[PDB]
Design a protein around this ligand. Sequence first.
Ligand SMILES: Cc1cc2nc3c(=O)[nH]c(=O)nc-3n(C[C@H](O)[C@H](O)[C@H](O)COP(=O)(O)O)c2cc1C
Ligand SMILES: Cc1cc2nc3c(=O)[nH]c(=O)nc-3n(C[C@H](O)[C@H](O)[C@H](O)COP(=O)(O)O)c2cc1C
Ligand SMILES: Cc1cc2nc3c(=O)[nH]c(=O)nc-3n(C[C@H](O)[C@H](O)[C@H](O)COP(=O)(O)O)c2cc1C
Lengths: 643, 643, 643
Amino acid sequence: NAMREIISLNEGWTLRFPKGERAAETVTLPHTWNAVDGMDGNGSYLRTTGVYSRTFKKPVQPLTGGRVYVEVLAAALDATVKVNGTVATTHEGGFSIFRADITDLCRDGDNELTIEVSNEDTPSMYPASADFTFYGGLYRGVNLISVPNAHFDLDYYGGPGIMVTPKPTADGGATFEIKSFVTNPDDSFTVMYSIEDPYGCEVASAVRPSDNTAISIYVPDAELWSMDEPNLYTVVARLQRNNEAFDEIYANVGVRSYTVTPDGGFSINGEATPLRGVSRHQDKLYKGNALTVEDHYQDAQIIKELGANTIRLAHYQHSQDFYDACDELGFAVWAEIPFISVFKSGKDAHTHVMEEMKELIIQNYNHPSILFWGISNEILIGGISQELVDTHHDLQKLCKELDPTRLTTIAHVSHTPTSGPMHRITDVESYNHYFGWYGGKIEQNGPWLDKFHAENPDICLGISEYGCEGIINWHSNTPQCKDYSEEYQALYHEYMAQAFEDRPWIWASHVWNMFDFGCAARSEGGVKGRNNKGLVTIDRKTRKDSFYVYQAYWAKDPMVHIAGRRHAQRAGETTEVKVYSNQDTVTLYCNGKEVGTQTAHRVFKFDVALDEGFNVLMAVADTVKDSITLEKVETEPACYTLP
Amino acid sequence: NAMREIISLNEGWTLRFPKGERAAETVTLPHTWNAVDGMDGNGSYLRTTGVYSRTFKKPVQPLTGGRVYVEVLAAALDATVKVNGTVATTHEGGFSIFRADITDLCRDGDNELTIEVSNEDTPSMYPASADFTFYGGLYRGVNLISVPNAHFDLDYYGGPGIMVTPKPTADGGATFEIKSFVTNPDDSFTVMYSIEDPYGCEVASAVRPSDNTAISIYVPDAELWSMDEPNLYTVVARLQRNNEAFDEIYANVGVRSYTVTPDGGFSINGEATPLRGVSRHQDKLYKGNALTVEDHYQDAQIIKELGANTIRLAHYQHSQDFYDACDELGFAVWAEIPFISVFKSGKDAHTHVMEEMKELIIQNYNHPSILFWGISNEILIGGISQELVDTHHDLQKLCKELDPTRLTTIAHVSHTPTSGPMHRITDVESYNHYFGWYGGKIEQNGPWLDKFHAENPDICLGISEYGCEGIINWHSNTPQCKDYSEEYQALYHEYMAQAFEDRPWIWASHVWNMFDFGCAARSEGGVKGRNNKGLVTIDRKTRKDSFYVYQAYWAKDPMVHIAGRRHAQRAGETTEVKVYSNQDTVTLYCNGKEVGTQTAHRVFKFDVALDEGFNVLMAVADTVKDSITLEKVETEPACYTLP
Amino acid sequence: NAMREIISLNEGWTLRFPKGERAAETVTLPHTWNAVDGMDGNGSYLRTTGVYSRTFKKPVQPLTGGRVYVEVLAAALDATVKVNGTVATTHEGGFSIFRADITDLCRDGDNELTIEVSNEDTPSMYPASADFTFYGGLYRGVNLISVPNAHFDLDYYGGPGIMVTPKPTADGGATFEIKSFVTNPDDSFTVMYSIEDPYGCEVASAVRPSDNTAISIYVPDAELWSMDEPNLYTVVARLQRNNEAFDEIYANVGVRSYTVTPDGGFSINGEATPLRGVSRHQDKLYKGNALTVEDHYQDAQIIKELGANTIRLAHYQHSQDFYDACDELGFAVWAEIPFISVFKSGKDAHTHVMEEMKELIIQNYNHPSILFWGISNEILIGGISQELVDTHHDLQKLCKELDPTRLTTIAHVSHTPTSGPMHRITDVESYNHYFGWYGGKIEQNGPWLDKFHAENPDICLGISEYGCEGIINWHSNTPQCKDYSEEYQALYHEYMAQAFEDRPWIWASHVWNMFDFGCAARSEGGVKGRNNKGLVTIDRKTRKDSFYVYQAYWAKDPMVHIAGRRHAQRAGETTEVKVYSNQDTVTLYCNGKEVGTQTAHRVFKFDVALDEGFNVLMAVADTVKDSITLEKVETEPACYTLP
Ligand SMILES: Cc1cc2nc3c(=O)[nH]c(=O)nc-3n(C[C@H](O)[C@H](O)[C@H](O)COP(=O)(O)O)c2cc1C
Ligand SMILES: Cc1cc2nc3c(=O)[nH]c(=O)nc-3n(C[C@H](O)[C@H](O)[C@H](O)COP(=O)(O)O)c2cc1C
Ligand SMILES: Cc1cc2nc3c(=O)[nH]c(=O)nc-3n(C[C@H](O)[C@H](O)[C@H](O)COP(=O)(O)O)c2cc1C
């Protein structure tokens, strides 16, 4: 990128543990020391200080005055960077980029880079109390940046050096208000802005002095961004002297406007579009949170095939890779900070939360997929206080100071009083409800929504979490709460899918959660270490039957799915064979004999007298078919039921 | 794949020779120490004991109970594997996968793997008497396999741990009878089966207990497999515990039925499809048999262009890569064991042949291209025995016990009595005939076939070997047996191609051989160390005129080939210019003047009066043209005739 | 390629300087020690002796007789190759391939290779007096070549070992006159020639004795080569023995014929096609001339988008990568030797130019893009002598002995007398003019051309250099010579582009230059170390407004460009907004308000009264649009004018 050089420093590390809990080991980044114990259900996970260290050569610039920066893409939870013995920087918060100018700590030839990382609790730390593992370490990798003396800003909250506000115009075009930030500007430097259309062709440009960089650029005939058509432009910014580019940065951006109203729900680009989707944690089976770029895009593609149009990226800042995948595949994204569960008093905990929100907005400001900033999750679990409420006003004020182009949101714990000072702080609001799993009946969800909506017709209500555990080796002919069966989780989501389709004024609903994820503290349903409320398993391999409920309710590609394939052995004179489809007519066959034809909306239930022995079940929708094999048995195996 | 990990161990080996024939060398697998002396004509090839050794790091499973296996893809001919000095396993037979569980012999960190390979004869060994170099060493590569304690079986005759039997159903679907094999099954483990269509979409599924894994899965509207349309399905098997896959394995398979009848020949999926093809050895110029996956696919592609629809994979188990290429590209494959030439009596020789066949079947059961198991080649060269006959009955019974879905076959040496105990053992039978090369006249082939067919109307007769040496620096105007010319080899195959077209009741015919191959004992026709009966040279570069004979008879894409280009200088008032085409009318031009137009079936002979000096011969078929240059000389060069 | 094995030796080098100007450094090829100081404007560049040194392993051939060559792709400007301390060869000339047979200097295992390179002047050296940096070192890389004892010639002038002369025939075909050159030919070796068509299919073949290889091969229905449709054939040659390829070389070639007449200009394949294009140097920003293959193709792609159909590759032999890029992308290439500015008298200098010319023709004879051999550039700067004129006639004779199929050309310095001995030597002739930049006025160019053509109606007149410096931080409301402004360089090329469009009898015009390039001696217009006459900056990143003039005049894809975006702040009651387009009607809008509509040929000038503040200038052509932002100011910045 012009004279800017980015060198990956992911290889060649030794991880030591000063308190001796593990022998030294050589590792490659991305890395966490909790990749296994953070989700194997041993009972705990190692929280402590791990020291990473490696050697690097000092990068060299052709021209005098070069500068060297180390870029950590995340250090969970607390970090100190040393070059050749001397502290270069410290950082708190384990989900955001931070950088350090290590120019003057560098010598020619080999240098030593030392990063102390701690995932231990501290008086100012968030997260501290949550239902998910705090994987320690350098789980996103580390970069070396070489730039000339004049270069776009690398020092401001790990930001990109450029902010872009695209807006549609009445005449069918778009304005891109752009500002970039130059370290050591000077009258001999300009900033040349160029905008490239989705196909790579330049469509607009403008030029500014390097010390006065704000400009608004107009693109005619703009291709708007939406979840269905995520059209992207590329803003390129070049720091120029004479006929030479010194620095170059760029940003993918999208043009969209959007509204949420209490009676109307969500609209984007003037079209009513109810947000129906999922939440997603950042871990994977025995990798901890140390995911590759392929991991992130694979998650995104699975969620796209589901037919979701929104993703709540709880409970922290995610990878640039996953925001990139959202911009490109088209999802409405809710991004949030880990201000979770239990308010911690003090100036330092207040400073942590504000800094983390400042980094979340500045590092992710250019992503068109991000529509909502979330300021807390379930913060009343630890009890309300005046101090806690003031922090939420401070955070609301910061989001509108930093970014008035986006809506603020909040996720309430289930028992949050439906009046009180926690409402009307943010532009929109959501509740985390588990009626039918942690308490109550499934049939309570609908009336709860209707009642709150009627009593608060000025609040935009969404559901930021709802869900139910499903452990796919348990299977019940009489599925009920706390049997943990795949069938009961499907019944829960059968109701909710239809509940949210009945209520477009719910601006967004988010299944908790897309995937099973790791929580060291969990033990229930015969499994340790896990939240198993996923529509898909933690290794991304197995779609539960709940997944196909949503696929039939959301996806447009024709599909037909026979539920209960893992209920392989069925006892009884008849058994219910359930089919999900986005077609409206399903014919079921059993060993070639027609069982029946039904016309229904999404869910189809057939009573089937299985033949003795093995049975081919074939469901014929319109252009799609499905087929599974079931076995009639006298008594179903002991292993289909929790001990 | 789930928690299964396969690591390539092809790098960083040291090859030593205990008896001192060579200095120690560092090698990379695939490797044979006979890559040069096995085909360079020096006189002999080194048969001895080579010792390979390298270090490897112990792989780590995230959960407790991890197991480690070493996988040797092939070791020619006899091997002993040691880990840290201790013997892990021994294996006899040089063409098939074997594995050892080395868990208890591994320590943390670096381990030492040592493999002692011998290609010397033993009282047990097959091959022992054949016309091809027994290249020695680790010529397919080595893998390391990490698996959890519960995993698909790794210990059974080097197999994949799954067997899949697809059959077409009457209503246009397919049943897949699947059985998988689990080491340490358990009530908490299930096997989840999934079937993907050629385009990667799931079309059917079933689930089973891990100690009772057999299931039949029906796929509607199945896409059938044939040599013209090799549609493949993927069967995936996952070992599942709760919401987590422990192990995963998979098999590409095709849906086809087929028949051979003595009068009707070969049918596949209901259509009479005479099998007309070639054999193929597994070596390549100065590589020995240490071929890469690209080499195998290159061979497959060259055979596909030839228009061949069957490949005889003589005389041993070939690479998985090549069976994969036959499944993907579509060839009817005859697969066989090296039970060749001279029968060795003794219980140990018996065990060898029985186990090599068992490995052949279990390691290749899932390939749809394999249609025929061949139990022996030319086994009466060493005289018939009652032990010999009984071993053939044992192999026939073994083949039908392990795999009733395929047909057995045998290749008789030319002088085998057409009556007697070697007939009616296998389902179909072939002969190796060389009338017109090893004696006899070309014109006896046709009558011989018709006499056998007329006398043994209950036998399905094929021709597994026929061919003729062709060395392309020798050229003759009066081509005759033993001048070794390219022209005589073409005349031989001109006749044979037409003979097999006339006889659809020959179930299969295989040219010996597709490529020149290495045999260290050969010395004839002015060349040492080669069998030069190939249609294509041993470096895969030059197609002989014999190749284009078969292309014209077999290939569907229009082509046209002027023969005799390497007969560059022609003497005589007229010279014959021969053209091969799969179009039916050829106009020949000589320096732009029209020489003749003919309508013929495949073969076109023109008598041409060449102008003095150089002549442009252009042949014009319907939509294609060919062009070569010839020179008119007074005396042809001495270098065109064997000395 | 058969038994030929090409190994790159670009890694693992140490570079020392005997005279101690620098410390020892390890380097990778391609490399030059003048990568930075040759274009940073410090004042000078290091011309000394650098000694590169690495160790390599002797390659092994499977048969006795193996040979080892070292191939240096270029060494600027003088080199000596040693293997294990023994001189293998010496070379003069910094831009052509040279090889050494090092078979006998080699021992088994590790050997040491030393290459002393010096870029200082010598009595025989060209280049010596020129406006570009003589970057020193191994700026194209080094190869090791292993061949059998019989192989295609590696010892004749760095040549490819084969020459191919394709010519179209009247019946729509093509003849390929082929000669290859075999070292240690022999009666058992034949050369087998094959011609593959653009799509990889063999269309023609011939075979020859290896002591007598010349042959003409006819291809029917030939696909012609042209700049618009650069169809390429592949000629393949194989050294064959028995059934085994010993060596293999190949060449990509194209079929074209072309003419130049004084009154008709240039024609290719019978269609008049004026050559309008650019020159190109081989350096890039702080890379010196150590360019990668991507750098070469990137330059070619940029020139293709510009719409040029001709590239003058001054002032030396360029890399094979770029000649390939011109063969593949389609440009008429003028290639030349660095016989520039000042004639050196004496026999060694004369030998230098004759040998460098010979290397140019032999190494590039097969490239269909090359149409013109250039013998000298501006050679009368140092005065005419009898000996200069003689050396020019020697070069003409050498060109027509080596290559009668191409046209010779020459580049005259501006003041070269329009009569006399420097004219009518070569087939065509060019002048380097800079009327309007080094003197005179822009409007003199047109009349000059018309006077020469009137006076010399038998000379084919081209313009091999013209241009004007443009430094893009300088902007002027009254552009004039020596303000160095982007606007004035644009005015220049606006006139010149229309000048050559008006004169199709100019056979070729070449803009000096396509890119800015490095000249250590230069210091002017506020920039040091640079010739800044490029249409595009030296880092390939920024197209000057001059670039879009030529794009409008040459390119076919619709485009529209508002000039002067870097004149970003504009003073005056009105400002001129200039637009370039290859559409003929442009509507300009200022902040949504129409300013005017014009129908012009390529260049559009609008007088705009800007609004106070920021202004959106949008230009609407037929199917394309352009948009830029301008600011109205009272006083334009100080930094738009040279101090
Ligand atoms: C999205 C966004 C990105 C920003 N990036 C930068 C930046 O990279 N560099 C910078 O100096 N200021 C940046 N700013 C602006 C600063 O917030 C503000 O102008 C001023 O520097 C106050 O800095 P403070 O937050 O340290 O008080 C950015 C502002 C926003 C909203
Ligand atoms: C194609 C094929 C693959 C087989 N793979 C296995 C296997 O992986 N593990 C196993 O225990 N049996 C496997 N079997 C079946 C065995 O033959 C079976 O265990 C048999 O009853 C035991 O006989 P044996 O142990 O003497 O071979 C396979 C059978 C076939 C036909
Ligand atoms: C394009 C071209 C390539 C040539 N390549 C070779 C070659 O590789 N080897 C060779 O012996 N001659 C080659 N020649 C021809 C030589 O000029 C020829 O051998 C000549 O008689 C040698 O003369 P010399 O030894 O005085 O240079 C080539 C000629 C041309 C025009």
